[PDB]
Amino acid sequence: KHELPNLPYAYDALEPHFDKETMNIHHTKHHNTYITNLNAALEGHAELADKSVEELVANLNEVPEAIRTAVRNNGGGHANHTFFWTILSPNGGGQPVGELATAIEAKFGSFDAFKEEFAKAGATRFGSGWAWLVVNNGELEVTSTPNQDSPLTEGKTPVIGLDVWEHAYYLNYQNRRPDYIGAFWNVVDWNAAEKRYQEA
Amino acid sequence: KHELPNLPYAYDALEPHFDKETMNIHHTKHHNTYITNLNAALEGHAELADKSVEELVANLNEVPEAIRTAVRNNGGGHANHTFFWTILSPNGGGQPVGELATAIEAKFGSFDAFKEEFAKAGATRFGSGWAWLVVNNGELEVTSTPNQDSPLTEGKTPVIGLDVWEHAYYLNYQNRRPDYIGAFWNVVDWNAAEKRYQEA
Ligand SMILES: [Mn+2]
Ligand SMILES: [Mn+2]
Structure with a gap:
């Protein structure tokens, strides 16, 4: 079911x-x-x-x-x-909004600095896996997980995430994972992200 | 270097x-x-x-x-x-040859049975990795390893192997990994494999 x-x-x-x-x-x-x-x-x-x-x-x-x-x-x-x-x-992209935005600024310094840490987590995940922004404390953390392991299993709540298995990007980007991660910023939905941040 | x-x-x-x-x-x-x-x-x-x-x-x-x-x-x-x-x-494919052919028959029963077991190891390697036929202390065994882990690290010697990272197959096969494994049988070099078996 x-x-x-x-x-x-x-x-x-x-x-x-x-x-x-x-x-x-x-x-x-x-x-x-x-x-x-x-x-x-x-x-x-x-x-x-x-x-x-x-x-x-x-x-x-x-x-x-x-x-x-x-x-x-x-x-x-x-x-x-x-x-x-x-x-x-298709209405995603741009700057973070809401209390999540403010929290990102506080935790990471700025949105650009956050993007950098997330992109490094994504690039550095060797083999198949996922890159995430999560709530752990009630604190924001950038993490990555292998294969289909979920932050939920570690008691952490996903706010945003990106699939870095090669099937997710190989057709359009081949080995260019960083160019794919760059493209994700133009489609990530910060309104939806705010909800997930608030709803946790 | x-x-x-x-x-x-x-x-x-x-x-x-x-x-x-x-x-x-x-x-x-x-x-x-x-x-x-x-x-x-x-x-x-x-x-x-x-x-x-x-x-x-x-x-x-x-x-x-x-x-x-x-x-x-x-x-x-x-x-x-x-x-x-x-x-x-490009001169690969076909039936195993040499002492390796005899050893495969003895260990696995037939070449076809061997291919089925290898195909299963490859299909079931979840995420990124490799499927192998190795010599383990004089004995043939089918194994799989995650990411870029090598059988060598466990004192086993590769005879044949197949890259099952999605980059190895996504452009031609997309999600159809079993069809890619099928295609490998037509290009695997059994003369080369015989030599690796002899030296192991
Ligand atoms: Mn996926
Ligand atoms: Mn490879």
Whole structure:
């Protein structure tokens, strides 16, 4: 009973920053496959299967050992991509807004300095993974995670994030990960980010 | 000190199985960058910069802690890719040959059974990595390693291997990793593999 969410915008709405071919394959093949595999691993655990994917992944510890890796990886994939689609927008880009903006200035010095730290976290994540701005204390932290591991599992709440698996950027940027991260700034939705900051 | 090896064949020599655009970017951008990063890391360590990259990665524990992660990832990348180019050929494909062929039949039952097990290791390596046929103390085994980790580090000797980082396959295959693994059977060089088996 885990379903693929529709995108909040057209498949070409993030162009030229994120290409429509990637949006299609990333959403309808990669994300869908995580869902397929999650639902299979949850066959026989109908009790577990009625949690939200976010709660499921936050309390990975309580998943039966037999299916834990499958939940970590595929539950991770579902939680992470679900989040991702909703922090992007064709009306995104620009400066941070709201109390999140003020908090970024305080924690990082400035928005430019934050962007730098986030881009370094993204560039430095060796292999597959994600770069994040999270709330831990009630404090902002830049982090990165391997594969489909989620900050939620560490008790940290995602405010924004960027998929740095090669499938996310290879068609448009090839090995140019930094150019991809640069493009993300033009589509990240700071209104949505504010909500996530406030809602945590 | 460490230098990018030329390919043993033209950039389009593995078509249609491995595309020439990928061969270009994979060799001259990805592999080159591991070498740049490795050389930067070994600045100030004469001890090490006399070692082969295979010696460095076999004895990773003897690398000073301050540069060990860099040598693991970039040393691993250089050793792994150097090896990879040498086990591919436009005169590749077909059935195993030599003493290796006999050993594969004995260990796995048949070549087809071996391919199935290798294909499964490759498909199931979650995130970035490599699938391998190695010799472990005189015995054939199929394994997989994350990121640029090498079997050498665990005292196992690679006979064949396949790069399952998405950069190795995304341009021609997108999410269809199993189809890429299929295509590898047509360019793997079993004469070259026989020689590695003999020397291991
Ligand atoms: Mn992804
Ligand atoms: Mn590679």
